[PDB]
């Protein structure tokens, strides 16, 4: 009878799928670039990118939903990485930047719940969640470009702990 050293489901390999509602996808990207993207294919396209510390304003190219896109990015922090939520509202629309997370753990989260897509916002270790109203939130398809874990919404406090502390 030994004693084990929190409840984690994963890690899973990068993939495209229709995630279950009421679960966090805890994303663990290792390098700069696209982290996760998802759309309802009608009026909401969300892609989160990751920028390493110390990046002066520069135009970088990301494959967002299979399309080469030029995005001007910047990370004025010299110590933490920067996640940026990129949003468009049509299949060919232009992206705007939102709800960044400045991060030491380099972890991100997204969840389909209650009519919104929920992501994390702010600067670790003080990230909290906020949500984007998303038509047909429950049927959103997502692509993860990094290994990830699945956490039920009941364990959201644990997910938040991971976001904020690694």
Task: Return the residue of 35, 37, 85, 87 that touches Na ion, per CB under 5 A.
Answer: 85
φ, ψ dihedrals at 86, nearest 5°: -100, 130
**44: contact with Na ion by CB under 5 A:** no
Minimum separation from the CB atom of position 69 to Na ion (A) = 18
Contact between 103 and Na ion by CB under 5 A: the answer reads: yes
Q: Which is nearer to Na ion, 69 or 138 (CB)?
A: 138
Rounded to a whole number of angstroms, the minimum distance from the CB of residue 141 to Na ion is 11
CB nearer to Na ion: pick between 89 and 133: 133
Instruction: Say how many Å lie between the first and final Cα of the chain, rounded.
Output: 29
Q: One symbol per residue from 108 to 127: x for binding Na ion (CB under 5 A), - otherwise; what is it? A: ---xx--x---x-x------
Stretch that binds Na ion, among 6-14, 61-69, 72-80, 154-162 (CB under 5 A): 154-162
For Na ion, which stretch binds (CB under 5 A), given 1-9, 27-35, 58-66, 102-110? Answer: 102-110
What's the rounded Cα separation, in Å, for the pair 64 and 85? 12
């Amino acid at each position: 009878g030994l004693v084990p050293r929190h409840m984690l489901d994963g890690p899973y390999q990068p993939t495209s799928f229709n995630p279950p509602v009421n679960y966090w996808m805890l994303l663990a990207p290792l390098n700069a670039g696209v982290v996760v993207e998802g759309t309802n294919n009608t009026n909401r396209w969300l892609a989160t990118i990751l920028v390493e510390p110390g990046v002066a304003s520069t135009t970088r190219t990301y494959t967002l939903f299979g399309i080469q896109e030029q995005i001007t990015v910047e990370n004025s922090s010299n110590t933490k990485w920067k996640f940026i939520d990129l949003m468009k509202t049509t299949s060919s629309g232009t992206y705007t930047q939102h709800s960044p997370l400045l991060s030491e753990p380099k972890l991100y989260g997204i969840m389909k719940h209650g009519g919104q897509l929920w992501t994390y916002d702010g600067e670790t270790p003080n990230a909290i969640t906020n949500g984007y109203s998303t038509t047909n939130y429950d049927s959103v398809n997502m692509t993860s470009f990094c290994d990830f874990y699945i956490i039920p919404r009941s364990q959201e406090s644990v997910c938040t702990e991971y976001i904020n502390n690694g």
